[model samples]
Target: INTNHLDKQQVQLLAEMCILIDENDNKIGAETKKNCHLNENIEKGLLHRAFSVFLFNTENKLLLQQRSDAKITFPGCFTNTCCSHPLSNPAELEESDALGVRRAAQRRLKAELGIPLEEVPPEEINYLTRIHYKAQSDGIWGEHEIDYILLVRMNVTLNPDPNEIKSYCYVSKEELKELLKKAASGEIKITPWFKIIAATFLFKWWDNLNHLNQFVDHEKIYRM
Candidate 1:
């Protein structure tokens, strides 16, 4: 994560091999230099990564993002409410800082959508489920990844990041499931990992939310 000690050429090489864009819209990919399909070797300058946030509003609709025309992969794919990474070309110091996780979420939220949390603290959400997938086109590869998940309960008006995304929408869990299923069936353009998670894990999160709330309510009743 930290690359500060490297020499000038090393730093520049790191930037080229690590910093990835659409070669069109300049959108960053979500994978490390070695893992990302593009310029696979660390010395080639291709690094990809992404931050995904699942926000539940009063209506419980999850926010979704539409990649902008400037994007490289899934140029117009509809994905979970939000996703991104720190500053695009994150500095070695910034990457090494223990706070990168928190920073990634904050930067992504504000960068992609103008919406920000109004009161309660932000909750970092980690996924026990991970999805690794690859999409290829004309010798180009979209090596996708999901680093960490964040869950927040709030109402927000989406402000999509123009340079990174096309637009955003709120959809119910059920609605999202249907879309995910169809995409998995090859009915639409979707991240493969998204499809796999939909098939294996989406419902668990929904059910878990209800169970957690019930436990809280039951405890409150007993106390009263």
Candidate 2:
């Protein structure tokens, strides 16, 4: 499970093309993942489509992943269960777009966390809400994306890929509250999006899955 040393092919896979969009999230063009987040592109903003997965156990505890320091963006930071973008080609919208996102989520779960498709099937995932948030990591890396937030409540085993994840743990809502408090005090570091997600969206919907969809639709983005 240690894939930290990425070969040329592996690097190419990681640098998959991403779908670029306008302020309204309409398809504009395509861009490589590397260039999309470059510092130069930040001000101009290469807005793209992305997704974040929030996996929870039957007990309702959230699974948090500590990103690998080897990551090109936000290395070693704590984030959601997983976050990534779908391929740009063969643009799929509406129901087709949901399929595309599911495929991307399933792929990343296996590639980055060693979770088999059978363990976390595409159909089992529940759509929560979407966010159009923007943030910059230092001056070189940043994100301007319409992110699809997904939820999955299942009891499954995990074998994380060291190249994508440094570590992981399940934390209850109370534990997460303390964690956020610690993060605010600078005792620990979390990804920028996760911080907003916790404060803005998650705290409200984490405990009550039924009320999540009522919060917002795909057309809207949740900003901090």
The number of the candidate with the highest TM-score is: 2
Writing each residue's lDDT as its tens digit, candidate 2 over 64-144 gives 999887776787788889999877856333345487777788878888888988998888777666778788876666888
Task: Please give the distance, in angstroms, between residue 114's alpha carbon in candidate 2 and its true position after superposition.
Answer: 0.6
lDDT for 15 (candidate 2): 67
lDDT of 1 by residue, 90-166 (tens): 44114332244446666556656776644323334332322333445224444534334445657766656576676
What is each predicted model's overall lDDT from 0 to 1?
A: 0.50, 0.79
The total of clashing pairs for model 2 equals 2
**Ten-residue stretch with the least lDDT total in model 1:** 215-224
Tell me which residue pairs clash in candidate 2.
Answer: 131-222, 132-221
lDDT of 1 at 80: 69
Query: Which ten-residue region of model 2 has the weakest summed lDDT?
Result: 1-10
Error of 1 at 50 (Å): 4.1
lDDT of candidate model 1 versus the reference? 0.50
